[PDB]
Design a protein around this ligand. Sequence first.
Ligand code: HEM
Lengths: 431, 55
Amino acid sequence: AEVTQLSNGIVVATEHNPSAHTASVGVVFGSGAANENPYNNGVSNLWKNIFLSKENSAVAAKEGLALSSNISRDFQSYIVSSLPGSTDKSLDFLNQSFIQQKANLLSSSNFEATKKSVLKQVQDFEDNDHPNRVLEHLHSTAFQNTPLSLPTRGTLESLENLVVADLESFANNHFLNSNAVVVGTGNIKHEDLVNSIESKNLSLQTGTKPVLKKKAAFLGSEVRLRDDTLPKAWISLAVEGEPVNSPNYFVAKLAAQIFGSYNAFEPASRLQGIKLLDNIQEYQLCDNFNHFSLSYKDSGLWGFSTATRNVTMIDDLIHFTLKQWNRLTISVTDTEVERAKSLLKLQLGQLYESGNPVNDANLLGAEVLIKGSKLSLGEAFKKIDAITVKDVKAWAGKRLWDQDIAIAGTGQIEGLLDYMRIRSDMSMMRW
Amino acid sequence: WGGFSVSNPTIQRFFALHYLVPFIIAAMVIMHLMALHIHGSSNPLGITGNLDRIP
Ligand code: HEM
């Protein structure tokens, strides 16, 4: 439970844990899909793919190292996992790929083979992963003509028109030192890693800063991807949520826990202490749903996603769900809040403390890049337990009550009513 | 007429009937709306409205 972070020439962040069996090392840059353009959209995802290319991956496999990368909206990460003893050989492969081979990975035979793979990759996503496809379009319409609208995997049209030069241009503008953080998770000590880093000098493009842009903004709107050939309807609906480092960061996440997630086929899920379940189970309004409180640097999204085969009652699904959310402003109970606290801790714990260091790296990296530090799991619980019904009400009355929404859906959505009908349900009539 | 010409019997029965018919018209309007409901309204293009309806 130690969050150590020091700065020499580069900012080093680590979180050591005795028993772990393995150690993960990697660099996390403060720029992701939110930094791209509509035309070079997908460059970051492309970088990730060559970094994991058969060539670069085989070089690490001989050495007994495993590679992992993750492209997000606000950040980007390249991670190498190793045994606690080879904590130095991971750094050799890291530097060898970001300075030495930052020209060998970009060969005309490797690039074309990779491009052909991310194309079949992004295509497969759009053709079959409907729930994530819908969630991606939700960001697209909610944050249209703004940084958060760009999809992480990039679009097919911007991808196929991408060249080696675009990779370089992005790398020379974002893979900078002032826009990076070296992260180490597993079991290795902070002093053990910082020494191996401060050993090898050479700045390489120091003092250089990444380009600036315009602030992200939420726009109440919708995108309907109707497709009657699909056997279900997948929808996602949300309001402007909370950005990371917001006073209500936790109040929002708790609010989403109150309604939680559901799976009609799992006996135990049908028994949860969620009032909404009394309404949706009678006629089986859906196969599943899940609420979320997505947070990013400039903004976020609070809402839910759902999947259903009850195509003639989608209006009841949306109506009952929105009536429940109305409650947060006027009648949420003490016990609902308390149930949420307990469940929020359990989920927040299971995330922050998993038996996998690669997840730890992403969580640590993403946090330190935005606030310059990481809030300890024990510190979070103190904030969570401090939330009162009055807090949730004040939050809901500002973020949910009579506020614009963003909608996205695909499949048999003929039954999903017009925007104004959904929007009207964001409140209730009163004397 | 109820007699040799338009007289008292005539006007009294016409008032009674004037009061009645509006209610028969009301019943006919319901039958009119029932027939309207099974196929819905038409539109200015003269073609199907099934591809884009709003509440
Ligand atoms: C008291 C009299 C009447 C009432 C209350 C009434 C009411 C209605 C209503 C509510 C509609 C739907 C909205 C509209 O299209 O305007 C409708 C449709 C229609 N009515 Fe009437 N109506 C009346 C008399 C008549 C008469 C006299 C005719 C013809 C001789 C008629 C022919 C139609 C037709 C054909 C439609 C369908 C229009 C379309 O969808 O294209 N109605 N009426």
